[PDB]
């Protein structure tokens, strides 16, 4: 063959923290099909928005939104335990079928995206140039989001542990731990990587007993 | 300047599943310093081996081992909660100082690696060619390890939940759940991605009540 039908840009979904996570890489020959198992961001979460993105930027908002749908009826479970399988399937005509399947509930939902959706040739070139020009800014956004995600999981896990310990956790211990959780949650509302990391470290420094107890 | 001192290859550490995780990318100008926070792979783990690797392959064993050390005295906590900060610092002379700091215990350990350690120019070219020739095999190894890691965390989390539920979990429920845990753990000892995923899915299909209970 002299030509191939290939994707001009990355295809994926928005994930926790406002980041684009790629399911089909740029320059993949079609037809193609790729699945990845994802999960809930918080304990007992009953629904996920699957938000389909096209582009090369790390920030979800900087890419081209192709459409979105919900999968609900996710049954109560700890954060990150339900198995939500997301599949991108591009058929021979270039139509994209995105589906999300909750292996724990059985429920499935899909959206169909026309081959003509998304960015046109000029906008595709602009996207590629943009990703090149902002490769550093995007790297910094990416590392801030992973640190903001780590802090949010540490915040939520420690709150659960506190409540589970109840009276077993000495007053002083609880005081130091609570103080630090509030400090972290404030840092998480902000934009500063190092501040989030310092509040995380402040928490590791006073949580010793809580851990111990939680492990008993 | 007409020349720069730059790394010829990736530097990092071995992580859970026998994978190389990069701390300093290939072609970084020295001096340079990079930290990433890592953690324990199992509940109550008291020590981590920091195993310093040089190279471009995903499998740890396929890269060049520069040395290793332990950090112990990690205090009991749930898997993934202790904050273990690993820092690679290459100074102006090309000497690499790797340290690991447990923010929760305060304990620190380091190793110093001479600038002349690791692969020579020929071996560096061979490494680069090898990574090129095996880019697919390495991608498949990488995805198998992430699936094997996900199953191992799901195995370990579900075992904890079972034990915590004790008598609250109906016999039948427990039976189906236990069956599936054994099936997963066997799949994890194997080499087959799809088999691991099917055992995970078998577990999501019978764990509904356990989750519910665990969430109460």
């Amino acid at each position: 063959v002299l030509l191939l039908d290939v994707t001009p840009l990355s295809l994926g979904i928005e994930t926790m923290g406002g980041v684009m996570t790629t399911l089909i890489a740029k320059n993949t020959t079609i037809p193609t099909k790729h699945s990845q198992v994802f999960s809930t961001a918080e304990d007992n979460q009953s629904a996920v928005t699957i938000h389909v993105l096209q582009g090369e930027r790390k920030r979800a908002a900087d890419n081209k939104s192709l459409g979105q749908f919900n999968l609900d009826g996710i049954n109560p479970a700890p954060r990150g335990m339900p198995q939500i399988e997301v599949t991108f399937d591009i058929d021979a005509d270039g139509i994209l079928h995105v589906s999300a399947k909750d292996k724990n509930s059985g429920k499935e939902q899909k959206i169909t995206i026309k081959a003509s959706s998304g960015l046109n040739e000029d906008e595709i070139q602009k996207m590629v140039r943009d990703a090149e020009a902002n490769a550093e800014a995007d790297r910094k956004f990416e590392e801030l989001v992973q640190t903001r995600n780590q802090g949010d999981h540490l915040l939520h896990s420690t709150r659960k542990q506190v409540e589970e310990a109840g009276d077993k956790l000495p007053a002083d211990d609880k005081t130091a731990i609570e103080s630090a959780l509030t400090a972290l949650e404030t840092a998480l509302k902000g934009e500063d990587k190092a501040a989030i990391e310092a509040k995380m470290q402040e928490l590791a420094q006073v949580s010793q007993k809580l851990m111990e107890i939680a492990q008993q | 300047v007409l020349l720069l001192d730059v790394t010829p290859l990736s530097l990092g550490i071995e992580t859970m599943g026998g994978v190389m995780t990069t701390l300093i990318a290939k072609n970084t100008t020295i001096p340079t310093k990079h930290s990433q926070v890592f953690s324990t792979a199992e509940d109550n783990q008291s020590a981590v081996t920091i195993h310093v690797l040089q190279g471009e392959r995903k499998r740890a064993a396929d890269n060049k081992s520069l040395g290793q050390f332990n950090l112990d005295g990690i205090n009991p906590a749930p898997r993934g909660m202790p904050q273990i900060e690993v820092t690679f610092d290459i100074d102006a002379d090309g000497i690499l100082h790797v340290s690991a700091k447990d923010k929760n215990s305060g304990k620190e350990q380091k190793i110093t690696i001479k600038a002349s350690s690791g692969l020579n120019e020929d071996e560096i070219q061979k490494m680069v060619r090898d990574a090129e020739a095996n880019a697919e095999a390495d991608r498949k190894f990488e995805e198998l390890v992430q699936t094997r890691n996900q199953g191992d965390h799901l195995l370990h989390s579900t075992r904890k939940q079972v034990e915590e539920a004790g008598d609250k979990l109906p016999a039948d429920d427990k039976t189906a759940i236990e069956s599936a845990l054994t099936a997963l753990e066997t799949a994890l000892k194997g080499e087959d991605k799809a088999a691991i995923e099917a055992k995970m899915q078998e577990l999501a299909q019978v764990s509904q009540k356990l989750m519910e209970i665990a969430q109460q």
Binding site: S39, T40, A41, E42, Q45, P76, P78, R79 | -
Partner: peptide, 13 residues
Amino acid sequence: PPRPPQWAVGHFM
């Protein structure tokens, strides 16, 4: 359990 106001797709443990 109280269900959170959260829609984010997260990573599978």
